[PDB]
Write a protein that binds this ligand. Sequence first.
Ligand code: HEM
Ligand code: HEM
Ligand code: HNI
Ligand code: HNI
Lengths: 141, 141, 146, 146
Amino acid sequence: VLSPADKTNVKAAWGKVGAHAGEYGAEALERMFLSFPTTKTYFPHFDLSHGSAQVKGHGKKVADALTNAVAHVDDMPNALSALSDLHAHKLRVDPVNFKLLSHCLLVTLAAHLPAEFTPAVHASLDKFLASVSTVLTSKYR
Amino acid sequence: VLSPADKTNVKAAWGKVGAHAGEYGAEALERMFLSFPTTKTYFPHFDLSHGSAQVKGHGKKVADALTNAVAHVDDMPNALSALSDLHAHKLRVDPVNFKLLSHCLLVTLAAHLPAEFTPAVHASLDKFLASVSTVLTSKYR
Amino acid sequence: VHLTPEEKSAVTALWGKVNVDEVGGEALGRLLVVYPWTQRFFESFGDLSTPDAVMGNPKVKAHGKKVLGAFSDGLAHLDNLKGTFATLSELHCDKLHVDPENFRLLGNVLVCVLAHHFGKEFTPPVQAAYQKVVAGVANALAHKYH
Amino acid sequence: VHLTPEEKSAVTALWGKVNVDEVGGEALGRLLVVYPWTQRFFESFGDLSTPDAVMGNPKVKAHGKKVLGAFSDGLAHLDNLKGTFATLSELHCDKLHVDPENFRLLGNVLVCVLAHHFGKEFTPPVQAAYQKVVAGVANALAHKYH
Ligand code: HEM
Ligand code: HEM
Ligand code: HNI
Ligand code: HNI
């Protein structure tokens, strides 16, 4: 469960990300594809190399979903309901991959937010991304 | 989430297990220590010799907790509240190990319940053990 | 993975008693029932709407047999699983686009199916040997991913 | 993995700029903050009750130094990580009773720390090389468990 401090930390950190949310989403995806090549199996229809228009566009979608999750941090199962439907019935990504993307999002945030990415905020963001991941895999079976 | 159909399958299967639960718990532990030796790192204080009474005793405790979870399958977070506290604050077993024990419990049930271990019951039992694991790691951080 | 000479014997001995048709069909079938998101790879197999439909599906059964046949061939290469599955590894990566995590799931289900069939004969030490094998096969099938 | 020569150079180049003592303390500290169940191994280290209590804990910092020191020495042997870490693997199993999953957790926290310190210099390809390294080191430290 996300603590009061967790939610304060997530809102502060994502707030600082601000207009960069989409850029950072795309960067996290690129980091994932390069660091964890097995994740590329879910994107055979994508150009995955640097400067990909498809990756940039998908990064924006992922980031916007996270922004919505932050806005509804006390009701994520319902706020993300349509998206969790899509993941369960269509995308059907194995749950391990959510940890890989989450890690790459953390790396991206660490690389861009020197002052903000404290150990406590790091901890809170990891919990947050784990909670989002849990919601998105909650309807798999 | 455990469906009403899942709960029916779990209650039926565990009912068939009956007083064999303690025995099957010990067998599942034995299977886990042999198949997944890293799990032994949580029991250096145990006698792990063959037929260990200490292991059998622990198997009984694990089984009894599962039996209680089946009996309160509609409200497992409350039924397992004290146990989840102990896991989070003292035992602190890494979450990856719960899947290893769950698998070994399934293998044990499959080996003892040739008629009851249908594909549907297999699926329900897996969901049930995953749900118990989720409750037991829910207070970790 | 490194099996002991005693474990290699136990693996080979048990496998000599395995009905590959039944176990293969059961393993692939249960993969699709227990972890239904894995059905994403088998839309061309037709009806996968119910557990009975999945287990009774002729293409599921045929594929399961084929998969377990390749698995069986690997049991004759236990000291070089990477080498013998190198071709299939590349295939699953580049042509089939199968997340290797699925190899682990199938291994899990296969061990359950073996336990279901053999009962008490599937002893904890025999299980331990087979866990080494399914881990080895999954790792070998994942090894050439890029 | 299987590092490319371009990746080995990238790893070596970045590591030359790393204060190993400092990064070690930071990485172990963050492990205990982000995954607080890992504190189970360090009851004798004293106060671990808050993020600041953990990060500034002198015994945590000291231990982090020796852990990343061993890690650092291993970077000179990327083609034989299993051999390099064999005695430490045996020690962590037989004497310390440390679940090897912890090595994986530490590796990913270390990657986060490197990104935090180096910023844009920690490029996606540089990260990818370091992910190969921390996976190799974790696998090597796990290899002699029994
Ligand atoms: C022990 C593990 C496995 C082995 C030995 C294995 C082996 C094989 C073999 C021999 C083929 C046929 C190759 C050919 O036609 O040239 C095949 C095809 C295929 N495999 Fe695997 N496989 C394994 C696991 C999996 C898993 C876990 C999945 C997905 C969840 C999967 C998905 C597929 C698919 C989709 C095909 C193509 C089927 C079609 O023709 O429609 N495999 N596999
Ligand atoms: C890169 C990964 C790691 C390396 C290279 C490493 C290396 C070392 C070394 C060189 C020692 C001293 C050995 C001795 O006392 O003879 C040590 C001790 C120890 N390590 Fe590890 N370590 C790693 C990861 C971890 C992790 C992730 C944990 C637990 C979360 C851990 C737990 C311990 C403990 C409890 C000790 C003994 C500390 C004491 O003396 O009280 N290690 N490690
Ligand atoms: C490794 C695979 C993978 C992971 C870990 C992952 C994790 C996540 C996370 C985790 C925090 C979030 C918030 C998220 C959000 C989204 N994903 Ni993900 N997705 C993944 C693979 C996909 C794929 C594949 C698509 C379809 C993209 C396309 O364009 O076809 C997708 C599509 C989406 C969409 C677009 C929905 C739509 O079109 O209606 C959103 C939003 N996602 N994905
Ligand atoms: C691999 C490690 C591990 C796993 C996966 C695990 C998973 C589980 C599951 C999963 C379904 C259940 C129901 C369960 C139940 C229990 N465990 Ni577990 N435990 C584990 C390692 C332990 C250890 C260690 C103890 C302390 C034992 C002792 O007596 O020192 C323990 C203690 C217990 C107790 C005793 C509580 C008490 O003394 O008050 C129960 C009950 N458990 N454990």
